[PDB]
Amino acid sequence: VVHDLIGVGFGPSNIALAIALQERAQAQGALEVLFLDKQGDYRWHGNTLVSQSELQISFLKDLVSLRNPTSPYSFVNYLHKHDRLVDFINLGTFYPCRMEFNDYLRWVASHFQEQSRYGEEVLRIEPMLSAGQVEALRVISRNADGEELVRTTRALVVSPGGTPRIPQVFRALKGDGRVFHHSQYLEHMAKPMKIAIIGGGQSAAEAFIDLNDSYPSVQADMILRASALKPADDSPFVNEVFAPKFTDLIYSREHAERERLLREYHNTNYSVVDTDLIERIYGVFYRQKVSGIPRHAFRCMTTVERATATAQGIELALRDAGSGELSVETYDAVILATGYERQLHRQLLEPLAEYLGDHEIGRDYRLQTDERCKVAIYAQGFSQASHGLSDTLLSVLPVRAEEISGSLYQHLK
Ligand SMILES: Cc1cc2nc3c(=O)[nH]c(=O)nc-3n(C[C@H](O)[C@H](O)[C@H](O)COP(=O)(O)OP(=O)(O)OC[C@H]3O[C@@H](n4cnc5c(N)ncnc54)[C@H](O)[C@@H]3O)c2cc1C
Numbered sequence: 001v002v003h004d005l006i007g008v009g010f011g012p013s014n015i016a017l018a019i020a021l022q023e024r025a026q027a028q029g030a031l032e033v034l035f036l037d038k039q040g041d042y043r044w045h046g047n048t049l050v051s052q053s054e055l056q057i058s059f060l061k062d063l064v065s066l067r068n069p070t071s072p073y074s075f076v077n078y079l080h081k082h083d084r085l086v087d088f089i090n091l092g093t094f095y096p097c098r099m100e101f102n103d104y105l106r107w108v109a110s111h112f113q114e115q116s117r118y119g120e121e122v123l124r125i126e127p128m129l130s131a132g133q134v135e136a137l138r139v140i141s142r143n144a145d146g147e148e149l150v151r152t153t154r155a156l157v158v159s160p161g162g163t164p165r166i167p168q169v170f171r172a173l174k175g176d177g178r179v180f181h182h183s184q185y186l187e188h189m190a191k192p193m194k195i196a197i198i199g200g201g202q203s204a205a206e207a208f209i210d211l212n213d214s215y216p217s218v219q220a221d222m223i224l225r226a227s228a229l230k231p232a233d234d235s236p237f238v239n240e241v242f243a244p245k246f247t248d249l250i251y252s253r254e255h256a257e258r259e260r261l262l263r264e265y266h267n268t269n270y271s272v273v274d275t276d277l278i279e280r281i282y283g284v285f286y287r288q289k290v291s292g293i294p295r296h297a298f299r300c301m302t303t304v305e306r307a308t309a310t311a312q313g314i315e316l317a318l319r320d321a322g323s324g325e326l327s328v329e330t331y332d333a334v335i336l337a338t339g340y341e342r343q344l345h346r347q348l349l350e351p352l353a354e355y356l357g358d359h360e361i362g363r364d365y366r367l368q369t370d371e372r373c374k375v376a377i378y379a380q381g382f383s384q385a386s387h388g389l390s391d392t393l394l395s396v397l398p399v400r401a402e403e404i405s406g407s408l409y410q411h412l413k
């Protein structure tokens with residue numbers, strides 16, 4: 001038994017897809033599909049779901065609405081089905097506590113229980129060759145019990161999210177419970193402290209406020225290479241870059257202009273914090289000046305040069321620019337809120353390397369391939385270079401999903 005499509009992850013990108021495929025199914029027939037996710041109980045970045053994490057995107061830019069507001073899967077319908085719509089309204093906000101967005105996604109997901117396989121991590125994809133042409137694809141995933149699984153599919157779409165970014169100096173410490181990436185924040189905090197946070201982004205700010213608010217025992221240092229925290233920029237003219245119309249424009253630009261646009265707009269999303277959050281962090285420090293009790297430290301300008309483990313704690317050599325001084329501090333724990341990297345060919349797609357072309361991902365999000373390769377491989381979130389800032393986000397999923405299902409059906413038929 002061969003599957004028309006299989007996807008890697010049933011995160012948002014892939015769910016949005018599932019819905020589109022379902023919408024097309026009535027007109028064009030229903031493909032047999034599966035989406036595997038490595039989470040037994042799926043939470044959307046669960047380890048990051050702290051008390052006051054606000055969706056950084058308008059709820060209207062949910063899974064279906066930009067394409068089809070009349071879908072049963074809109075955030076609003078979800079709210080209605082949970083008898084919460086009126087109440088949400090009295091809220092007057094556009095940005096739901098991310099815990100809520102999570103429920104929505106889980107709820108939407110429950111509607112595809114047949115297509116979703118959870119608890120299965122995909123390890124690699126192998127070509128199945130008949131006559132030197134890749135007719136089908138082999139997907140190898142390992143479940144929670146440790147049992148590997150092999151399935152065969154006509155088409156593949158990979159939407160696994162990103163992998164955490166570890167600065168070099170910390171790579172030495174892989175495996176020390178004492179140091180952990182933000183992404184894994186809830187698991188590790190469940191095990192009087194000094195903790196350090198590395199990075200000046202949202203993930204960094206969110207860790208800090210959470211520690212301050214939830215852990216009185218804790219004193220936190222935010223170590224920033226950058227001078228300050230810069231505000232995420234969401235103004236309307238600017239926000240127009242997360243538009244569906246923009247994907248077209250950016251795609252058609254020469255490589256030089258694309259990067260320019262990406263540089264000019266980096267601040268929409270990366271290394272920036274929400275305006276309200278900065279104040280609140282700013283307020284916290286201000287209060288220290290008042291109280292005179294210096295619990296926390298804002299080490300802007302600081303670069304970690306040496307990090308080493310110890311019986312005592314973790315030793316960091318911090319270079320503070322503008323002082324030029326190098327000083328040593330030791331922390332009970334360190335938190336890396338250094339972000340994510342989405343690099344497309346991991347060990348996961350290696351087996352196909354031979355068939356993947358030089359030219360960039362397709363406008364339709366299909367990787368270009370050899371004439372040898374007859375299957376179709378698609379990716380979501382790995383085309384930021386060519387598809388814009390919207391790519392790694394929730395911004396165009398509704399649209400992107402239509403395009404992809406459109407190709408997939410066209411490929412299949
Ligand atoms: C903490 C955090 C908050 C964010 N908040 C927002 C926001 O408010 N608004 C916004 O627009 N964007 C936000 N983003 C950006 C985010 O990338 C998108 O919102 C969205 O998560 C992208 O969806 P995705 O399905 O493509 O990837 P993901 O949501 O990361 O889905 C990938 C899923 O597949 C699993 N997986 C990974 N590898 C494999 C594999 N080997 N095999 C099987 N499963 C695998 C993962 O565990 C995960 O469940 C946020 C990102 C983070 C990290």
Ligand SMILES: NC(=O)C1=CN([C@@H]2O[C@H](COP(=O)(O)OP(=O)(O)OC[C@H]3O[C@@H](n4cnc5c(N)ncnc54)[C@H](OP(=O)(O)O)[C@@H]3O)[C@@H](O)[C@H]2O)C=CC1
Nearest residue numbers: 053054056167199200201202203204270271337338339340
């Ligand atoms: N919806 C929500 O409430 C949340 C949304 N987010 C989203 O997740 C995505 C990524 O989040 P986040 O990781 O915070 O943002 P970024 O990945 O953009 O931020 C990374 C931070 O780490 C620093 N950094 C990276 N490498 C090093 C290094 N080698 N040495 C020192 N510092 C380093 C960067 O500093 P520098 O700028 O100087 O390079 C930067 O401040 C974004 O889309 C963000 O909006 C994150 C958390 C919650």
Ligand SMILES: NCCC[C@H](N)C(=O)O
Nearest residue numbers: 056057234239242269395
């Ligand atoms: N970091 C999320 C940015 C979302 C973007 N401002 C949008 O409106 O799509």
